[PDB]
Amino acid sequence: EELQDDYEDMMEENLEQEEYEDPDIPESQMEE
């Protein structure tokens, strides 16, 4: 192969659009 970087999906995975977002605020309430 060695040419997956020419495709839209692999390039989108490489660019890592999720790394530019704020995921959430970790609260972790102790109450059950």
């Binding site: 970087d5 020419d6 530019y20 704020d22 605020i25 609260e27 102790m30």
Partner: protein, 451 residues
């Protein structure tokens, strides 16, 4: 006569003779009586190096023969997969039609060139384009009995362009010659992929400085903002590309741009621990108190990622050491939640309040005891955190540690004089929390001390 020798060298693959003829002054766009220039003759015989060299010599890529065929048509009809790939990478129109209406996909399909068909379909060739007689690549493949071509044409259908635009591929590989040819053909440097990113984004991702400078000199937007708000400066800051960050700031990148989550490039640099990029942005005027949608500042991002030197640098640039998110979490709260005792120590040595209160009254000591982070607890208790502090529900750190079952933290708290007789708003003691969660060892150690 020199042009004839150049064409013969192009046909025979003699690259040295063709280059010598071009040096002597032979027109690059010369062609024989059939209209086939050097590019056509090189494409017919599979001479990839000759094709690349002639494309570098500003030969007209979309030249047509007397039958209306381009170089891509000839390479598809001749079955030269490498030449087809090279022509497509340099910007050949895969949907060009000849005089009788044939397309490169049709010519590959009629000659059972399965690899060429696959590559053209992946690059956006439309199989619905018919000739003057109404035939399609599927129709001629069915007529000629090319079963594999028929199968692939039926299965692919209209999946469309799955490949990147050629300029994006050139920017990924830092290929300045291919990018120069592409920009000579198509003047626009801001061609968009299916995701919405320009080739400048790709160049900034891989820190391909040469192609990035080439794109910026041709008129690329240094502050091209897609729907997600991710600028090339954001990508360069996130990836750690210091030289790319400097290049983008030199060409006029906006430093206060926010993404859809309101992340500034300072946030991207701080969350990944890039100290030099953060310093460059702060020296260029980055707001150090910029907040995301959740209220996180860059120091929150740096503390979250255990980026010690980034926290030091931000504190050196007058960052608020007790900045609060929407949940009122200080960077000390984040360090206690993530177990980063080094970040917590750096924050505490510079005056961060050890007894800061979150929304539910949780202190950093409470969060350290909840997550079994003993070292953060030790540093907080050394730096004056209240061991008997209560939340809004009356929970002491011993309450949280006993409920969570973290036996070493329970033992450490009891060795320092914490009282197991404390009570919640429900009057429940740490022994109640240990018994309601089935922690036999924690309950036994609580009983052995004062209960």
């Amino acid at each position: 006569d020199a042009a004839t020798s150049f064409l013969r060298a192009a046909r025979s693959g003699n690259l040295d003779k063709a280059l010598d003829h071009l040096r002597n002054g032979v027109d690059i766009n010369t062609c024989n009586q059939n209209g086939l220039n050097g590019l056509h003759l090189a494409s017919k015989e599979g001479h990839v190096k000759m094709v690349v060299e002639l494309l570098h010599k500003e030969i007209i890529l979309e030249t047509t023969t007397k039958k209306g065929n381009t170089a891509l048509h000839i390479a598809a009809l001749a079955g030269q997969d490498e030449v087809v790939r090279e022509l497509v990478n340099y910007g050949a129109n895969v949907n060009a039609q000849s005089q009788k209406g044939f397309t490169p996909l049709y010519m590959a399909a009629q000659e059972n060139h399965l690899e060429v068909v696959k590559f053209l379909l992946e690059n956006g060739a439309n199989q619905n384009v018919a000739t003057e007689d109404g035939f399609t690549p599927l129709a001629v493949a069915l007529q000629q009995g090319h079963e594999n071509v028929v199968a692939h044409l039926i299965n692919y259908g209209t999946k469309g362009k799955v490949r990147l635009p050629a300029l994006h591929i050139a920017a990924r590989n830092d290929d300045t010659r291919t990018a120069a040819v592409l920009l000579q053909n198509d003047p626009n440097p801001d061609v968009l992929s299916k995701t919405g990113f320009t080739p400048l984004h790709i160049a900034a991702h891989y820190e391909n400085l040469n192609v990035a400078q080439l794109l910026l000199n041709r008129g690329a937007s240094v502050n091209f903002t897609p729907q997600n708000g991710i600028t090339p400066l954001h990508i360069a800051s996130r990836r750690g590309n210091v030289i790319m960050v400097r290049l983008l700031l030199d060409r006029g990148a906006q430093i206060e741009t926010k993404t859809k989550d309101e992340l500034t490039p300072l946030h991207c640099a701080a969350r990944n621990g890039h100290v030099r990029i953060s310093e460059i942005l702060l020296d260029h005027g980055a707001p150090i108190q910029a907040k995301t949608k959740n209220g996180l500042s860059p120091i929150h991002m740096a503390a979250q990622g255990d980026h010690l030197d980034c926290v030091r640098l931000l504190l050196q640039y007058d960052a608020e050491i007790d900045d609060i998110t929407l949940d009122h979490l200080t960077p000390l709260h984040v360090a206690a939640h993530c177990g980063h005792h080094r970040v917590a120590k750096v924050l505490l040595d510079k005056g961060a309040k050890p007894n800061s209160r979150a929304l539910n009254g949780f202190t950093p000591l409470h969060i350290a005891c909840k997550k079994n982070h003993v070292r953060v607890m030790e540093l907080l208790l050394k730096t004056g955190a209240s061991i008997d502090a209560v939340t809004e529900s009356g929970l002491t750190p011993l309450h949280v540690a006993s409920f969570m079952g973290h036996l070493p933290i329970v033992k450490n708290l009891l060795q320092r004089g914490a009282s197991p007789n404390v009570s919640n708003v429900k009057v429940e003691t740490p022994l109640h929390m240990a018994a309601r969660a089935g922690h036999t060892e924690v309950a036994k150690y609580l009983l052995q001390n004062k209960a």
